[PDB]
Design a binder for this molecule. Sequence first.
Ligand SMILES: [Cl-]
Lengths: 85, 75
Amino acid sequence: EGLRRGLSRWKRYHIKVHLADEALLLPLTVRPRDTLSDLRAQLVGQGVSSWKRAFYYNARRLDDHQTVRDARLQDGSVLLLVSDP
Amino acid sequence: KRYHIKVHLADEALLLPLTVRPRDTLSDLRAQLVGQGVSSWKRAFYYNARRLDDHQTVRDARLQDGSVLLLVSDP
Ligand SMILES: [Cl-]
């Protein structure tokens, strides 16, 4: 049932957010429960100007309330953070 | 002199290292990606989210060691 996922409560993904505008790769440690909003909040804590920027994975736009699990991210996954004028 | 850059293939979500010379054109980088099986037809390079011209050199695009380019498929 949920035994497997139960025994992995402390699972952390080490991912990368490619900030397109800065051509920078920011590493984030994230939980599969985290929403992209949590990721945005982490990035804001690093001074990333998040206003009017969206996440893309496999070149498709992600809704801010998807989770790291729903986005099917894993260790090493690279997200793209894209400005919209 | 060689730079070690990365190309972020947006569709595949992969980060491909390339070794390039400052005088390499982006057309040369494309041929490297094609040699690695990257389906490059109608994909363009972006840096700082500005579309790049294939005739531009690594040097003139102001790339350096560790620069991350972005390869994006066209409309
Ligand atoms: Cl040459």
